[PDB]
Amino acid sequence: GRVIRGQRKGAGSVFRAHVKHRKGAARLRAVDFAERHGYIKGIVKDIIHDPGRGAPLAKVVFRDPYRFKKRTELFIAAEGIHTGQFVYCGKKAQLNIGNVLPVGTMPEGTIVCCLEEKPGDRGKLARASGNYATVISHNPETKKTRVKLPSGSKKVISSANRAVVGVVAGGGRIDKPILKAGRAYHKYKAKRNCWPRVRGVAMNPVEHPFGGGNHQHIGKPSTIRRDAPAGRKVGLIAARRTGRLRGT
RNA sequence: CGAGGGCGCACCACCGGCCCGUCUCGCCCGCCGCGCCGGGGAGGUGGAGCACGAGCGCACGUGUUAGGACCCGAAAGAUGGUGAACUAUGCCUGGGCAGGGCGAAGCCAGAGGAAACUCUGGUGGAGGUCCGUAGCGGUCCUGACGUGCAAAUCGGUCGUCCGACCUGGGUAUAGGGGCGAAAGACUAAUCGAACCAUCUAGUAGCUGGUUCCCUCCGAAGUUUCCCUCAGGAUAGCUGGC
RNA sequence: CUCAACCUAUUCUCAAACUUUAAAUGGGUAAGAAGCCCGGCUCGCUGGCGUGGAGCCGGGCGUGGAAUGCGAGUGCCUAGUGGGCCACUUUUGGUAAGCAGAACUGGCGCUGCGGGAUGAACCGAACGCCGGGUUAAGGCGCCCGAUGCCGACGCUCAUCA
RNA sequence: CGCCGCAGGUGCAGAUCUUGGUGGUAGUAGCAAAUAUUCAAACGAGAACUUUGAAGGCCGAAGUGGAGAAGGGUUCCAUGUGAACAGCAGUUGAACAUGGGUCAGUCGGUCCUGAGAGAUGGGCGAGCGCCGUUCCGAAGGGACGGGCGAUGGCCUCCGUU
RNA sequence: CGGUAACGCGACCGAUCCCGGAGAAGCCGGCGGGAGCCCCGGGGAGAGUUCUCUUUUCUUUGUGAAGGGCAGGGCGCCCUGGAAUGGGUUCGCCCCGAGAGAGGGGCCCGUGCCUUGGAAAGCGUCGCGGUUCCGGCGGCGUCCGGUGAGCUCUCGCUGGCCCUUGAAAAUCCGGGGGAGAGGGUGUAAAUCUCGCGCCGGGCCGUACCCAUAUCCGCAGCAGGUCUCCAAGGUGAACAGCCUCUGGCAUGUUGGAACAAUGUAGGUAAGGGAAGUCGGCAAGCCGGAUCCGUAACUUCGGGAUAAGGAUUGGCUCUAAGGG
RNA sequence: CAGGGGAAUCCGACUGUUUAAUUAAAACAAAGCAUCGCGAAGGCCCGCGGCGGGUGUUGACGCGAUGUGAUUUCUGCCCAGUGCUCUGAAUGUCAAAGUGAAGAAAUUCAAUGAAGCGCGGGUAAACGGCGGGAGUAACUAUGACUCUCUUAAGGUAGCCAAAUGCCUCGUCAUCUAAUUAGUGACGCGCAUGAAGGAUGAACGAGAUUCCCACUGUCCCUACCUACUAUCCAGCGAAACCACAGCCAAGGGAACGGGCUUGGCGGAAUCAGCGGGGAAAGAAGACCCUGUUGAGCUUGACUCUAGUCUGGCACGGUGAAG
RNA sequence: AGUUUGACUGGGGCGGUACACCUGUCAAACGGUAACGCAGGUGUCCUAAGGCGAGCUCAGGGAGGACAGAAACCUCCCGUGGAGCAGAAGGGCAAAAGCUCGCUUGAUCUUGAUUUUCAGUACGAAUACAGACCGUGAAAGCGGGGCCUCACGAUCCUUCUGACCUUUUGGGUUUUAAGCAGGAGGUGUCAGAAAAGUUACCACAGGGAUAACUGGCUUGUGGCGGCCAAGCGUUCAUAGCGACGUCGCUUUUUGAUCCUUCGAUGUCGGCUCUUCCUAUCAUUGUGAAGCAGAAUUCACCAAGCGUUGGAUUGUUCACCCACUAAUAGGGAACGUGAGCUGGGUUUAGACCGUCGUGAGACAGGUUAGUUUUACCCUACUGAUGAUGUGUUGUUGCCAUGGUAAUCCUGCUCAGUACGAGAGGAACCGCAGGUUCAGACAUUUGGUGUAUGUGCUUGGCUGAGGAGCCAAUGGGGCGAAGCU
Ligand SMILES: [Mg+2]
Ligand SMILES: [Mg+2]
Ligand SMILES: [Mg+2]
Ligand SMILES: [Mg+2]
Ligand SMILES: [Mg+2]
Ligand SMILES: [Mg+2]
Ligand SMILES: [Mg+2]
Ligand SMILES: [Mg+2]
Ligand SMILES: [Mg+2]
Ligand SMILES: [Mg+2]
Ligand SMILES: [Mg+2]
Ligand SMILES: [Mg+2]
Ligand SMILES: [Mg+2]
Ligand SMILES: [Mg+2]
Ligand SMILES: [Mg+2]
Ligand SMILES: [Mg+2]
Ligand SMILES: [Mg+2]
Ligand SMILES: [Mg+2]
Ligand SMILES: [Mg+2]
Ligand SMILES: [Mg+2]
Ligand SMILES: [Mg+2]
Ligand SMILES: [Mg+2]
Ligand SMILES: [Mg+2]
Ligand SMILES: [Mg+2]
Ligand SMILES: [Mg+2]
Ligand SMILES: [Mg+2]
Ligand SMILES: [Mg+2]
Ligand SMILES: [Mg+2]
Ligand SMILES: [Mg+2]
Ligand SMILES: [Mg+2]
Ligand SMILES: [Mg+2]
Ligand SMILES: [Mg+2]
Ligand SMILES: [Mg+2]
Ligand SMILES: [Mg+2]
Ligand SMILES: [Mg+2]
Ligand SMILES: [Mg+2]
Ligand SMILES: [Mg+2]
Ligand SMILES: [Mg+2]
Ligand SMILES: [Mg+2]
Ligand SMILES: [Mg+2]
Ligand SMILES: [Mg+2]
Ligand SMILES: [Mg+2]
Ligand SMILES: [Mg+2]
Ligand SMILES: [Mg+2]
Ligand SMILES: [Mg+2]
Ligand SMILES: [Mg+2]
Ligand SMILES: [Mg+2]
Ligand SMILES: [Mg+2]
Ligand SMILES: [Mg+2]
Ligand SMILES: [Mg+2]
Ligand SMILES: [Mg+2]
Ligand SMILES: [Mg+2]
Ligand SMILES: [Mg+2]
Ligand SMILES: [Mg+2]
Ligand SMILES: [Mg+2]
Ligand SMILES: [Mg+2]
Ligand SMILES: [Mg+2]
Ligand SMILES: [Mg+2]
Ligand SMILES: [Mg+2]
Ligand SMILES: [Mg+2]
Ligand SMILES: [Mg+2]
Ligand SMILES: [Mg+2]
Ligand SMILES: [Mg+2]
Ligand SMILES: [Mg+2]
Ligand SMILES: [Mg+2]
Ligand SMILES: [Mg+2]
Ligand SMILES: [Mg+2]
Ligand SMILES: [Mg+2]
Ligand SMILES: [Mg+2]
Ligand SMILES: [Mg+2]
Ligand SMILES: [Mg+2]
Ligand SMILES: [Mg+2]
Ligand SMILES: [Mg+2]
Ligand SMILES: [Mg+2]
Ligand SMILES: [Mg+2]
Ligand SMILES: [Mg+2]
Ligand SMILES: [Mg+2]
Ligand SMILES: [Mg+2]
Ligand SMILES: [Mg+2]
Ligand SMILES: [Mg+2]
Ligand SMILES: [Mg+2]
Ligand SMILES: [Mg+2]
Ligand SMILES: [Mg+2]
Ligand SMILES: [Mg+2]
Ligand SMILES: [Mg+2]
Ligand SMILES: [Mg+2]
Ligand SMILES: [Mg+2]
Ligand SMILES: [Mg+2]
Ligand SMILES: [Mg+2]
Ligand SMILES: [Mg+2]
Ligand SMILES: [Mg+2]
Ligand SMILES: [Mg+2]
Ligand SMILES: [Mg+2]
């Protein structure tokens, strides 16, 4: 009869992201005439640590083509780029690590970092550290490009979508065991209130579907339908299968 | 006074009769409408009826009922508000944590060895490291106290004491909601649904109470029915006129 | 020769759910005037028949047709109650129960009083306030009213009467 | 107030009844956590407790020391009083009464933003309103620069407009 | 305007605009500098002891801000030059043909010292007058040194840790650029972040308590309630114990007794858990030095395993430095 | 000022956290392991409402939802059941709307056929389940071996009278003089067992057994100290109270202070004490009843937010079928 | 989200249905009559098993007949029903009510009355008529279901049937709808709601109308006795026993019941402490033996005195070790929680096994879990006092109440009596111990703040000397007193 945890997360109050010390939204520069037709040269000024994010951010400085002014972007750092390096964004940009150019102008098999989901928005795909997408095929008739997302799923996008070349820095961060409840505490204190996690079987029936019983047992199948109401769908949601993955 | 006789009030029993409904049987009558028209009879039976009215208004008493309903009494339910000064958790900005032990990586030197490499002594000062202050906690005495110092405190003994550490202030989350390293915990001494006012004199087959005198009469705990078995209706028993 | 079963005549012992017979106590009805006896009339019922039956109309009969006691009949409104319990006797379950369950009458509940020392129910008796007399049940060594009778006849000795 | 009528918020021993008052308990339990007081004198009606002096002790700098924040709100400081209060007392008091006391360019607030809160535009909403905080706004009311001039005047030339 | 340079000098024209800096950054370690305090040796002034001894013991023995100068600390700043037989160097590190060692410079901080302030004040003593209660008047003094793993602040250097990287904005400044402005050689002009001079700074708060009696807990309630300063001895020590400065009167009463039963604290012959549900409670052990340490193990631990010896006072000796 | 120590068993890895006011634990958390959803027109969630809002200043090395719980080593069989999920294969059923027919219309009938349910696959680190019957070896006894049934499979590796074993204080060994205790072992195990089983250092105010040392826990009590209690001056409550207050027996609502019969009974008090007053504290919380509730659950009844699906409208322009 | 989750009931739950009915009995000779009284039955079945009429006689047995037998069919005789009538039981029934045939649909349409339960309400069932229309029989008649006693169902709603019926709202026609009358669809909790759990996180109103603990009745069961004497006892009923039976007592067992207590009587065990009982384990005095002695057994008077230390377990019980004269059994609100303790049971946390879909449950295991108040009355323990002898004191008496001692060992008797032997006593006496009691401190021990006297750590008074503080600084020895 009580609103469960997970239901309370959508209200926001105590579960909002900790964004006090975040350095800004990491994103490409807006597509403009210079990037749509030629290229524009920027210079990497610093590579910084964004709290709550494993990928380093790159602070790149461009020239505004219409006003005497300097523009500072907050690219996602592709691995290998350094300060004092020139990166080039545009259609005519060359195929080098850190450059930003449309997918339609890249050979099949190119590894990319900050890929646009829609032509014009800034980078949306393969942004987490060590991840990358791959260009698979081109359809110049429909102005389409087929790519392979980090999850393995294939996706057809417009050829005007831009991406950074290379993998995103931050390497194999998940390889190191955390080893300590304290290090998990510091990891999630920079992200949001999602830790520690109390098992539902350890709760009372009032605050969880799995709660209650004289033994800590689920009592009902933990696989739950997709259209189950909020407050009921806990456990394995819409699970196509369960159990140890044998076969692939 | 009076055997006998007569008219007989009210009322009671019975038998007839009349009105409406409904059956059964049957033959007649009426005429501006000749009809799938209208009326009538006899014999049963259904009616809270007729059969020379008794009602209306007012007052009083008793009984039953709806209302706060003889008085006091729930656990609850609903509507609208007030609280995070305590606590729970997130964030912001500050403050704080003796003295010792162990001795991680890194580094220096020496030695052994044919090499490969190993050994030894220093240095270094890591760690949700150990002993142990302050702080934070609260194990046991099942100690004190138990109309207390105290609506949870005190003594000794204890756990931890560089971290998932302690803490001020500022903020955010509000009641079927919040928040929970999860005990149904905490949410102003209140929590298995806070507090405040109202609906509300909530309902109670249940408990308690129910205020002057004398006189007269005087019970029942049984029948039948009831989601009836601590209650009613019903007959009985009672009193009054 | 012997033992079974069978039959016949006997013999022992029984029955809430067996019975020929069959009480006591018990239940119903009658013990007149709305009765009896005479005549007649009505009927579509019945029918050999003036036959039956019923109803109706007149008339005559009072020794008022057992005992005993009592004044009856009738209507309206109506409260409380709807937990009962006990005793003699009958009686079911139970080893039994101050158990549980029935029948009959009485009681307590609702009830005081005399007696049972004491006691809701036993025994006597029911109640206005009193005087006198007499009792019931029960008593009469002393408590404590009354045997302080020259009471009658026996029985009994208990170191748990 | 009696009598004849009329009308009631009309009669109390109870309700762990309501309000008020009062007993026994009972001059009882008690005034026992953190070592501790003593001598002399003064004032005074009155001294275990006030004041002064002399001793003996305690806190032992993580104080029983010296200062602040929050909170209190005059408790601060003098003088006086001895009703009540300070669970004994008091000549004392944070009590009572009468007066007095808080002085800033440079100590803070004020200013800035933080987590956040919150109008407008817009949207929603029966509605009080609430959602949202850059989102769906014609969102800059400013400026030495230049020009047209009013020459407003110490109209030279520089301020104004 | 000067210097090869780092950069310096008292100013050092300049808008819109652009770039940058400061504000503006965690925790922990180890070193170093400065101060305050503590300590030691003398010189004064005043006190204490003097039964005996003690040239003794105690107290006290200043220099604000803001300037100027000078030490001291730091520099990932410059010039010369070119280094292996590598050298320099730290407690640790670390550094160098991308320029070591050496020599010479420059800059930053300068809270330390001197000086203006400044002795005239303050303080300590010793006196003399009074304004019933004079910032009175006066004398004398306010001195010289030494030490440190010392404590506390502060400044600096250099490391470590992080799947943790530790605000923002007001506000202030520097630079880039050169739109412009200023005078015709003067009596100079525009301009000036240089020196001195003139005027002003409104509003609100401000006492006191800050807790075993000024706050919350119904109270003068053994509870709760955020901080700053921090002496001597012992000692590893902000431990416990004793003391100085400062504070207090024993925690809302006293007096007399010393029964039981309590509450708190001790001791107990011989035995040693036989007590009890149960070694509950109490007791044993304990610091430091020198030895000596097992099984097992995730090789880190176990581990202060277990077990043993020693420990005072006094008189010396030896080693460890500038 | 200032650790008693040692040998083991159970549980939890450790550090951390927890029921403020009876439970600090073995409970929670944890790192590690595993599973699930999701490529943004999205997953999960809030919201009365807005193309509103949180995750999200995010993007699969991420976010969301679960389970187990460090290391080591393993994690067996079962997809019948209930879940979940995948494709609709001629398809069964299936509402509104739409279509056709009859009728004078209301209406009636028929055809058509969305999700869903059925049907068919997958899935147990989803919920869960893992049994009997027979026959069968040359002492007996068991059954290596062979058939079955319910039916989806019959409990594998391990571990055990375990915090899980009724019988049970199981049986054997060991520890003791003596042991329902402990440890080791056995195992047809009422009713052990594999994301949890079995181990294994370090750790623990966790549960247990033993040994050394140590002692007033005890034999068996004594003495001492401080504060009380005590007495006094001053000050001064509360709880509770039908009336009260000596007993034995009787009867009685079956345990009397009162009543009957007996024993008896002598002011006013002080310090103690805990036998009685079925002492006080609270309209028993156990148990039952009530056509009295509330918290929670679901295969109860009746609904509902949200979601999936069909239809109508916004809703338009062209062609191929 | 809202609500529900029956009742009865020797508490409730589980189980049953005694919840609507029928038969016999209970039931006490009218009728009626109860319990979770006894023995049973019912929710159907039948176009015939209904209705007439006719004709027959059934069960069983005896005797016969080819196969044919103990049972096949045929025949005769006996046959009061001993068969059958659908079913449970009871009644009833013989040219019946049974069996077999023939014809049939009275199992139809109607109005009232009555009986049964009963309130004299309903339903159901039944009885007697009356009016139709039929069946059957020659007819009298019989028949509107079953030989009788059971076999079943309101309002509202639905559905069907009937009246050339009524209404369908200003009139008319026609669909439709409503109505009147009679059937059916059903409520089995059967006079008739539409209904799953859990709560140890729990709540309220109450209940001693009702359980768990004491007490009370009872005493089946437990325990302890007696009577008879078949037998056991080499023989011998009775030294010691006691089968088959039978009579009792007890209330330390467990039941049975539910009278008191639910505005509360604190619920196990242990510890502590007192008293009581006797059904006597030991001790004193005795009697009997299959008592030679020693030992043992049975019984009597008898409760004065004693009845112990430990391992395991919460235990009560149990069991073992060891001592002993013996290690008897019990009561006192299963004595004793303002006496304690809190191990157990019995709240809330948690784990495991089993059960359940789940919440959750488990006379299953395990771990952690607040034990409050006396100052009142009495009782008791002690302490002053009080009444009466004129006051006051000394010395006394004893009414009454209490009461206290207990058991064992060794030596001697005595290697004696007795006995074949092995063994093996007793009385008198002596020396001592156990348990208990009342004292006491010469001695030994304990205490020790005489704060007595040394020693000693840290600090403090300038040092010496003398001291002090550290909640008794520590420690050695220690008078007196207490013990
Ligand atoms: Mg978890
Ligand atoms: Mg839980
Ligand atoms: Mg739920
Ligand atoms: Mg569960
Ligand atoms: Mg008539
Ligand atoms: Mg009436
Ligand atoms: Mg009322
Ligand atoms: Mg409701
Ligand atoms: Mg707060
Ligand atoms: Mg640590
Ligand atoms: Mg520690
Ligand atoms: Mg306690
Ligand atoms: Mg719970
Ligand atoms: Mg009310
Ligand atoms: Mg009642
Ligand atoms: Mg009876
Ligand atoms: Mg009565
Ligand atoms: Mg009467
Ligand atoms: Mg009477
Ligand atoms: Mg009498
Ligand atoms: Mg009598
Ligand atoms: Mg008499
Ligand atoms: Mg007399
Ligand atoms: Mg009144
Ligand atoms: Mg009154
Ligand atoms: Mg007193
Ligand atoms: Mg006192
Ligand atoms: Mg001191
Ligand atoms: Mg202070
Ligand atoms: Mg003052
Ligand atoms: Mg006073
Ligand atoms: Mg005042
Ligand atoms: Mg100076
Ligand atoms: Mg150099
Ligand atoms: Mg001077
Ligand atoms: Mg001030
Ligand atoms: Mg206080
Ligand atoms: Mg207040
Ligand atoms: Mg005080
Ligand atoms: Mg004191
Ligand atoms: Mg005092
Ligand atoms: Mg001893
Ligand atoms: Mg000893
Ligand atoms: Mg023991
Ligand atoms: Mg013992
Ligand atoms: Mg202990
Ligand atoms: Mg060890
Ligand atoms: Mg020496
Ligand atoms: Mg743990
Ligand atoms: Mg583990
Ligand atoms: Mg805690
Ligand atoms: Mg607690
Ligand atoms: Mg606790
Ligand atoms: Mg693991
Ligand atoms: Mg996890
Ligand atoms: Mg379909
Ligand atoms: Mg599978
Ligand atoms: Mg196995
Ligand atoms: Mg086992
Ligand atoms: Mg066990
Ligand atoms: Mg033991
Ligand atoms: Mg074992
Ligand atoms: Mg598995
Ligand atoms: Mg008595
Ligand atoms: Mg009650
Ligand atoms: Mg209650
Ligand atoms: Mg009822
Ligand atoms: Mg409810
Ligand atoms: Mg359903
Ligand atoms: Mg009879
Ligand atoms: Mg009869
Ligand atoms: Mg016939
Ligand atoms: Mg018949
Ligand atoms: Mg009924
Ligand atoms: Mg014989
Ligand atoms: Mg009763
Ligand atoms: Mg009864
Ligand atoms: Mg009580
Ligand atoms: Mg009591
Ligand atoms: Mg005897
Ligand atoms: Mg008892
Ligand atoms: Mg108690
Ligand atoms: Mg008691
Ligand atoms: Mg316990
Ligand atoms: Mg529990
Ligand atoms: Mg299960
Ligand atoms: Mg505990
Ligand atoms: Mg005597
Ligand atoms: Mg005696
Ligand atoms: Mg000394
Ligand atoms: Mg000396
Ligand atoms: Mg001192
Ligand atoms: Mg001594």
Residues having C-beta closer than 5 Å to ion ligand 4? A 212-213, 219
Resolution of the PDB structure in angstroms: 2.6
CA distance A85 to A120: 25
Distance A184 CA to ligand 43 centre (A): 59
Strands of A86-90's sheet in order across: A70-73, A56-63, A39-49, A86-90, A100-102, A162-164
Residue A35 to residue A40: CA distance in whole angstroms: 6
**What nucleotides of chain G have any atom within 7 angstroms of a protein Cβ?**
1, 351-362
Q: Is A71 helix (H, G, I), strand (E, B) or coil?
A: strand
Rounded distance, CA A94 to CA A135, Å?
Answer: 16
The method recorded for this entry reads: cryo-EM
Q: What are phi and psi of A68, to 5 degrees?
A: -70, 100
Residue with tokens 């997360």: A9
- What backbone phi and psi angles, to 5 degrees, belong to A89? -115, 125
Q: How far apart are CA A146 and CA A86, in angstroms?
A: 29
Which nucleotide's C1' is closest to A211 (Cα)? G359
CA distance A190 to A13: 16
- Taking the C1' atom of every nucleotide in all shown strands and the CA of A193, the nearest one is B90
Cβ–Cβ < 8 Å for A150, A112: no
CA Rg, chain A, in Å?
A: 23
Q: By C-alpha distance, which of A117, A118, A150, A119 is closest to A133?
A: A150
CA A55 – ligand 12 centroid, Å:
59
| HEC sequence for A131-156 | CCEEEEEEECCCCEEEEECCCCCEEE
Q: H-type helices in chain A, by residue range?
A: 33-37, 181-189
3-state SS assignment for residue A57: strand
Q: Where are the alpha helices (DSSP H) in A161-201?
A: 181-189
- Positive or negative torsion for Cα A12, A13, A15, A16: positive
Q: Which nucleotide is nearest to A233 (CA to C1')?
A: F65
- Maximum CA pair distance of chain A? 73
